[PDB]
Amino acid sequence: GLMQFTLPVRLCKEIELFHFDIGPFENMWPGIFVYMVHRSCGTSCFELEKLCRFIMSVKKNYRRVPYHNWKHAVTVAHCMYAILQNNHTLFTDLERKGLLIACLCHDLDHRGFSNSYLQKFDHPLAALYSTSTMEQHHFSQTVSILQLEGHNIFSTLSSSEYEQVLEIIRKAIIATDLALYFGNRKQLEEMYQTGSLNLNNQSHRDRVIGLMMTACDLCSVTKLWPVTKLTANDIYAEFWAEGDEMKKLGIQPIPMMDRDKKDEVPQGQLGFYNAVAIPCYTTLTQILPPTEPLLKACRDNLSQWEKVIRGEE
Ligand SMILES: O=C(NCc1cccs1)c1ccc2nccnc2c1
């Protein structure tokens, strides 16, 4: 009960900021996550024996892939933490619980390949789940880990609260499918401008939670430039592995994924910030004004990519 986690001073201050980097010390990340659940949720939300056992089993089931790894899990959980702490009264006790667990679990057992590559490979997961293949898998893996003896961190919830928390986590993990972002954001942009957006309307909250999930998932573009630039490397390490695996199926991959076409990366990053990142954080700032720093940092990184193109770095 009286056992808090404390970070060193600098982490303790920086962790409250959207652009916080969780750092290179793997052994500190579970502590960081627990610190965030205790501050976001309460010391009371989870039995700490079970939370620790849940965290270390989730970590075990992330793979040693360049980007879609444990560090990404905790980085995405941190971004959700910054949004929840900056919007303290807009979210239920159940949503703050569910959403940080959703983020930590959102890419469980990722192999570093797009849904498109699973479909073209004809992977068994593609037979089992026709759309949002990896994301239906990540939710399935979360439910598997929650069911291990000693891991049900939600055990103290009523029957109905339990079903609600697993529904929040399912929708939240499905929403990380970028293919669903475009429709979701458009619907949110219309609802906001026509003035019909209503946070007491569940269908509306669901959509807003989807946007948050996309925003947290992409939060690499919202870091200080050296973090953004060095994370892009890991992201492209995966894209190029997949491009290589496409060429092994006798399919020329899209330029983004072709390691032969590295030159085109800066322009591809511009399109990504323009088509995806900026619209995402713009719409999110409109619905949740206190998330303006994510839109600001993203605009800043777009400009850095423009400078890279103009040969200035
Ligand atoms: O998923 C990416 N590109 C393919 C698609 C975009 C939209 C729908 S499918 C992508 C591209 C570039 C990134 N740079 C940074 C972070 N995340 C990134 C993610």
Ligand SMILES: [Mg+2]
């Ligand atoms: Mg994912």
Ligand SMILES: [Zn+2]
């Ligand atoms: Zn992710």
